[PDB]
Design a protein around this nucleic acid. Structure first.
Ligand SMILES: [Mg+2]
Ligand SMILES: [Mg+2]
Ligand SMILES: [Mg+2]
Ligand SMILES: [Mg+2]
Ligand SMILES: [Mg+2]
Ligand SMILES: [Mg+2]
Ligand SMILES: [Mg+2]
Lengths: 117, 127, 82, 98, 200, 146, 60
RNA sequence: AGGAGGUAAAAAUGGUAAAAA
RNA sequence: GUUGGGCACUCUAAGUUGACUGCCGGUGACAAACCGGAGGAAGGUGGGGAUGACGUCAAAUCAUCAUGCCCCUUAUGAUUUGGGCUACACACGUGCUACAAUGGACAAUACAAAGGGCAGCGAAACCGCGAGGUCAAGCAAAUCCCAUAAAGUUGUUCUCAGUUCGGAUUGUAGUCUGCAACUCGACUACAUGAAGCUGGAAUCGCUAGUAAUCGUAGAUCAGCAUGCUACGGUGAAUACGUUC
């Protein structure tokens, strides 16, 4: 069922359906399913209500998705106000990591603007 | 106690054959051939020498190294064929027609300079 | 990245502690862009060599662990048409 | 025992250097193991045959190394300085590992 | 252009290396100070030298000079003073031998330099090759080819004239074919000569 | 320039079951190709209640054509008769290429429905044989004499 | 500037990662193999004269 | 062998001027 | 196979035997030669390489080198530090990874050839979730090390969903080489989860151990490989006739 303030797909397995929460991937899902002693092969449809609260109790130790938005965006918003190198690359809309911008910056550049002379 | 031996080479793999009279079950590298080879279709062509000469009462013990499982099994039939000719010279004519006696000379070709493989060329451009 | 202490250049750090005796004046010239900004570096305004000239740069209390050179941009890009 | 490794660049200047050393061992009797050939160590160099352009035209160069291993047992007083005394043709070095 | 050195193909088949020594370590440094021995000889020697072949052992280097006039290299006071210069350079001991050559014009190293020094005397390029073609065929050459290329008569644009007499099979690899390219430095620039001689 | 030889399979001892393994073989991997053909015969025998080779020999003849066009020269198609080995070439190639376009979610399941369909004289690989006779019998008129 | 480039390479530098390598015959910085210490152009004319010991053309 | 009558429609353009017995 | 023995088998690399249209049949101007057949590991220049006639394109290089002539010489030569060769509205060439079920993930287990190693190759053990860290056995090589070969096979599981497909993008925390990774290195771990559902007009390579696919090694190099050069595993389909 619903856990940690987010809706969960019910038909799938627990260790896959916990990766639908922003902040939990394939490793930190199993790192809850190994300490709380819940069988990893259970369906989310077929839990009881005791094992649901046991998983839900330890999840709030890890950062929820509401925390991670203001934690990640504050790491970007302090980079722009100090006028760093990659602070202004966030403003330009260009790749941060130093990729060659001759041909492919298309994830940041977006759609194409075809001209020639 | 009489024991006929043959050597069989195919595709960077060589074989050493010791055959004893007994039940017709192949032994290779001190194991059984069920786990040693993934496909039973290979067993049909390494039992091809016993088919054409019509005999049997032969228990073969093989020792191979090098190559992969096609060349390391289709070289075993080369050793079986050259050891059955040590048992009877008259058996040669039945082995000659199928071609089990001869060795395949097909080995891997050389990567030439300028080409990505032996016979593979880079893509051509504005002509 | 380096697990060793953030990179000290012996000439740069010498004259930063030679500023905390009487007064924090506003200009020291430096050619070190590879020097990590220490927590002692704050309050002093440097002059890095952009290339053409030394450009001004101030350090606030949000610059620890950042290089001295990344605040000065070396190549300038104006718009392709505007 | 006495281990003698010959190493040269030719299969002919090392073929006579193996036989000419082994008679001098036989002059002190017997017990010298025959020449057993070791696998060669050959190295390939691939250079562009042009000067400026033309990456697709190369030329393949080769350097080979040939080996012979001779073992001698039961050393005698005459046999030591005898094989040390004779001078092999240039291009092959003796590695004596007694 | 589109032909290789015929001497360079046949090294390892029917030609021998000029250097004969094995070096497990220091093979880079023991080669480039051996490359200065043969550079030192070819400048000082005018004795017409074909081979500067080298054998090396521990503490020694053997120098088997092949030359046209052997008395110029032999001299006593001429040879040992050269040996004194060779001992000073490498700080190792050398041992020089001098080998002569009969049939001077049957060696393509010496036909190439003789033509190139006569072209600096500005003699006609068509007849410097033609005497060289005639002289070898009487001395016993089964074939000979000679080529001079460049600004031949002093012309503003370059060309190349060549001559032959007899068979010179260049695709046959068991054929022993001598070859050398020498230079003439004119006031009009450079000048390349090339001589093939096939003796059988 | 001849075709060399192919030896039969161990299970059925036939020349054109092992020739079908080569057509299903993608990327030079033979082991996956054998499982798709040896297990689809087990699925056919569950549906049909017949021998797997017996449904196979029936469905192969329902795909194999007898007379096909050829483009030569405006646009002319000339119907010629087919050699007895291009029939097995065109036959079981249509059997595998039209079985990948079935719509089921397993090629182990897609291959066992085409041999079930084509034995009952219907299907995608059978209507290709219908449209290589129909195309070759509209223009049978002009092209045989020339 | 080929004279000062071959001349600046011979003395030891302040930092031991500034140490480039060049040809010994021609003083070329690229395409030089460290076993012979000569460039790809100087390696070809020496092999074709027969002066490097034990080197031929491979045709395997 | 010789005479006679005809071809599965289509499909433009490309300054100037020299090299060398 | 580790030690006693053995050079039978394999392997190593030196020397030799062998393939020539040399026998048989037929056609052929009795000739050249073609179509078969025997023996034979191999048959019709066995497979592949190296080898590029005279000439053509005022084709490429004066920045490998060498050089006729021309220019600079208180600079167009020389020194160091920082920067740039890595920019970015776009257009093109060559590749890599994908769009999934002939698949993705987790376990167990199978078989190579080639080549490199002296202050270089780093065995084992212990430590770290991993990249790695400590201590160092042996080894100038058919010995020791790089080095578990991968695809494969046997099992469990996922169920046609932009997903348990894809791994771009960005945040944090690291490891290592180096005097020093801001412009501007490689890798790891966690979180993030972009376009992408087989590609218009046009276009490319390939005839057999080849196409396709799967790993491995070397040179350059302190550190850095989707490139280049080499090596083996699995391994097809098709040639009717033309050359319009
Ligand atoms: Mg091109
Ligand atoms: Mg460097
Ligand atoms: Mg026209
Ligand atoms: Mg031009
Ligand atoms: Mg600089
Ligand atoms: Mg995945
Ligand atoms: Mg889909």
């Amino acid at each position: 069922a619903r856990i940690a303030g987010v809706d969960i797909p019910r038909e799938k397995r627990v260790v896959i359906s916990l990766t639908y929460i922003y902040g939990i991937g394939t490793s930190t899902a199993q790192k809850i399913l190994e300490e709380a002693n819940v069988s990893a092969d259970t369906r989310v449809k077929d839990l009881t209500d005791d094992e649901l609260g046991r998983i839900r109790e330890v999840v709030d130790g890890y950062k929820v998705e509401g925390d991670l938005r203001r934690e990640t965006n504050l790491n970007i918003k302090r980079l722009m106000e100090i006028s760093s190198y990659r602070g202004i690359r966030h403003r330009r809309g260009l790749p941060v990591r130093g990729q060659k911008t001759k041909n492919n910056a298309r994830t940041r550049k977006g759609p194409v603007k075809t001209v020639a002379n | 106690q009489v024991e006929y031996r043959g050597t069989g080479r195919r595709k960077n793999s060589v074989a050493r054959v010791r055959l004893v009279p007994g039940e017709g079950n192949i032994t290779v590298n001190n194991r059984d051939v069920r786990e040693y080879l993934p496909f039973e279709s290979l067993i049909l062509d390494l039992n091809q020498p016993f088919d054409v000469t019509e005999t049997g009462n032969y228990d073969v013990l093989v020792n191979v190294h090098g190559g992969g499982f096609t060349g390391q099994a289709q070289a075993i039939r080369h050793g079986i064929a050259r050891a059955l000719l040590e048992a009877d010279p008259e058996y040669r004519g039945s082995l000659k027609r199928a071609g089990l006696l001869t060795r395949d000379p097909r080995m891997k070709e050389r990567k030439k300079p300028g080409l990505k493989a032996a016979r593979r060329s880079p893509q051509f451009s504005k002509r | 990245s380096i697990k060793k202490g953030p990179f000290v250049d012996e000439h740069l750090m010498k004259k930063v502690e030679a500023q905390e005796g009487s007064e924090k004046k506003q200009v020291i010239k430096t050619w070190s862009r590879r020097s990590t900004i220490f927590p002692n570096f704050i309050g002093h305004t440097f002059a890095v060599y952009d290339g053409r000239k030394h450009v001004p740069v101030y350090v606030t209390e949000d610059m620890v662990g950042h290089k001295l050179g990344e605040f000065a941009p070396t190549r300038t890009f104006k718009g392709h048409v505007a | 025992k006495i281990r003698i490794r010959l190493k040269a660049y030719d299969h002919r200047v090392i073929d006579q250097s193996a036989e000419k050393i082994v008679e001098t061992a036989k002059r002190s009797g017997a017990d010298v193991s025959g020449p057993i050939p070791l696998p060669t160590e050959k190295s390939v160099y691939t250079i562009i045959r042009a000067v400026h352009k033309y990456k697709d035209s190369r030329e393949q160069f080769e350097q080979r190394t040939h080996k012979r291993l001779i073992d001698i047992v039961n050393p005698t007083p005459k046999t030591v300085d005898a094989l040390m005394g004779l001078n092999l043709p240039s291009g092959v070095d003796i590695e004596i590992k007694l | 252009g589109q032909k290789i050195n015929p001497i360079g193909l046949r090294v390892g088949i029917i030609r021998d290396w000029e250097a004969k020594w094995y070096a497990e370590k220091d093979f880079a440094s023991l080669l480039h100070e051996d490359l200065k021995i043969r550079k030192f000889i070819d400048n000082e020697l005018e004795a017409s030298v074909s081979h500067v072949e080298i054998e090396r052992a521990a503490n020694r280097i053997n120098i088997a000079i092949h030359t046209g006039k052997p008395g110029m290299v032999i001299g006593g006071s001429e040879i040992e003073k050269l040996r004194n210069k060779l001992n000073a350079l490498t700080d190792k001991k050398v041992h020089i031998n001098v080998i002569e050559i009969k049939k001077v014009d049957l060696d393509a190293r010496l036909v190439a330099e003789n033509i190139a020094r006569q072209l600096e005397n500005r003699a006609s390029f068509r007849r410097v090759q033609k005497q060289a073609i005639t002289r070898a065929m009487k001395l016993g050459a089964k074939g000979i080819k000679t080529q001079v290329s460049g600004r031949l008569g002093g012309a503003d644009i370059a060309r190349a004239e060549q001559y032959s007499e007899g068979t010179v099979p260049l695709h046959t690899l068991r054929a022993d074919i001598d070859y050398a390219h020498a230079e003439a430095d004119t006031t009009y620039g450079k000048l390349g000569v090339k001589v093939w001689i096939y003796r059988g | 320039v001849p075709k060399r030889d192919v030896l039969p399979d161990p299970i059925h001892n036939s020349k054109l079951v092992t020739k079908l393994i080569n057509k299903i073989m993608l990327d030079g991997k033979r082991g996956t190709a054998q499982r798709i053909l040896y297990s689809a015969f087990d699925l056919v025998e569950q549906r049909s209640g017949r021998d797997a080779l017996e449904v196979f020999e029936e469905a192969i003849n329902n795909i194999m054509p007898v007379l096909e066009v050829k483009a030569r020269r405006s646009n002319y198609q000339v119907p010629v008769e087919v050699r007895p080995e291009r029939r097995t070439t065109l036959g079981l190639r249509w059997l595998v290429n039209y079985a990948r376009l079935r719509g089921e979610k397993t090629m182990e399941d897609r291959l066992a429905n085409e041999i079930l369909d084509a034995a009952n004289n219907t299907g995608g690989a059978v209507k290709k044989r219908e449209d290589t006779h129909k195309m070759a019998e509209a223009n049978k008129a002009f092209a045989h004499y020339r | 500037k080929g004279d000062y480039e071959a001349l600046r390479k011979l003395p030891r530098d302040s930092s031991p990662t500034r140490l480039t390598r060049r040809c010994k015959v021609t003083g070329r910085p690229r395409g030089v193999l460290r076993k012979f210490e000569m460039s790809r152009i100087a390696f070809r004319e020496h092999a074709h004269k027969g002066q490097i010991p034990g080197v031929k053309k491979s045709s395997w």
